[model samples]
Target: TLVKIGPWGGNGGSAQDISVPPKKLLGVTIYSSDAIRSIAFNYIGVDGQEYAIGPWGGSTSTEIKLSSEQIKEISGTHGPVYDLADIVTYLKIVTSANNTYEAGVPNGKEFSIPLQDSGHVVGFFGRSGTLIDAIGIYVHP
Candidate 1:
């Protein structure tokens, strides 16, 4: 039988109708002083499998954060990096280094990573709701 899913609370639908993709989607853009690395994508599925979306690499281990100045060098553009706080709005964690994914809003300034070149990077995107931690890669921009 077909089932309806959420609009929870005074919302509508059933749990069965909710299609959480088996994998977690993460995007990274590597930049260079001269050219841009076509956005690299990756995902980790609920089954504990990791896969690369494009020509990038995959990591079973979690990535740590770097300094703001380091992030600016990776993206390769100057000033006003893409607001990572905004990107978190759409992401849901499959699993992380600390705890399992739960529902809540994130806190604090975002974190980032330095890239391969002197001025580019790739890293995590938002703060974890439970911890005061912000995660993700930051490229030069």
Candidate 2:
């Protein structure tokens, strides 16, 4: 923990949204949540709702590359569906990521997201944006 400069972010260790600096986010690992559920949503053209948690095993490991649609739905700009704020409320299904899901970037590709808009996450600064990644979500009772 020596260098702390520029628009860069490395490993995350908090109950907050992780910002991928250097714009080269290659790996994504969603922790476990009691909210075992899923969200069937659509962002513009991206339509998906089938993804398990924890036992992440798309091909082999628990980590898998986000599908093209997933990627767009999470980061893609424009439209209310793309916006995490709207997306979050829309995903009031019944799951909080389910299991341990992981992701990775292919090459020099990366994406950034805003602080997720959750019950815990209240409000942020001005006209900037809650601009977090979006698509689906879940909750429990």
Candidate 3:
């Protein structure tokens, strides 16, 4: 299924009250073409916990424009839920021709941007349905 960028809604896990040591963030890489103005993470901790975290940063507007053929090619190559960790090393946003910003996340988490660009992705690398407890973010000026 294809989804467009621009204020798309997302949901993590339910809230719980268990202090599980922060595991390596898996399934937390999101990709897009529009400059990432912000990011948010959501998860439920141990014992029916819930959390959300958003990293304030800038992202490049290199939108991944996927052609029908390209999309098909990608789907054939990656199937569904592409592993972003295997693709991008860092996040960046280009505000001007001369300005580009970047940020990094812990080992395991998924990210999602609202815009569409070729090869754009957001995902987590750990076990599916892990509990998370925070989400926050703000765009740079």
Candidate 4:
């Protein structure tokens, strides 16, 4: 089964809805500058097809390869940026191997996602303008 997590932050941009089959997440790539610019994903579909899906806001790049690991936990801060538009201010991702990937400064309201069991993050969806205005996750349960 799959579970959808929060779409934290503000509604400043267009919709960013993306999802994949369970256990399909291979890696992730994020683009940021001051505030989070966008996010992209690497997935292996049910047909054993490999594909890339988005840098969902704007484009700038940083990549994290998951290899044999899975996303264990996700935490971040979200609130107002530039002017009145709220955006994801900080992002921290932890993997099964305890690897951490971070971006932006930690500020604003804090939020975290930890699967009660051993489930992993399979996809992402949210809102994005010129920056990542909000974010959410899809978990394989």
Each candidate: what lDDT? 0.26, 0.20, 0.27, 0.82
Per-residue alpha-carbon lDDT of candidate 4 for residues 72-135, written as tens digits (9 for 90 to 100): 8999998777784689988989988888899877769999997667788878889987788999
For candidate 3, the per-residue lDDT at 5 reads: 25
lDDT for model 2 comes to: 0.20
For 1-141, candidate 1 gives per-residue lDDT tens digits of 111111111111111111222233343333221111122345444455665533221111223222232323211111111232221211122222222221222222222222243433223332222121222342322
Compared to the true structure, candidate 2 yields what TM-score?
0.20
Model 4 residue runs over 4 Å out of place are: 19-22
Q: Identify the superior model by lDDT, candidate 1 or candidate 4.
A: 4
**Best-to-worst lDDT order:** 4, 3, 1, 2
Better of 2 and 3 by TM-score: 3
RMSD of each: 16.5, 17.8, 15.4, 1.9
Instruction: For candidate 3, give the lDDT of residue 42.
Output: 42
Ranking by TM-score: 4, 3, 1, 2
* lDDT (10s digit) by residue, model 3, range 62-130: 232211211111110101122222222234333212233344332233444432343322212211122
lDDT tens per residue, model 2, 1-141: 111211111221112222221111122333212211121111111122222222111011222232211221132122122212221111111112322232222222233332233321111111112222222221101
> What range of 10 consecutive residues in model 4 has the weakest lDDT sum?
15-24
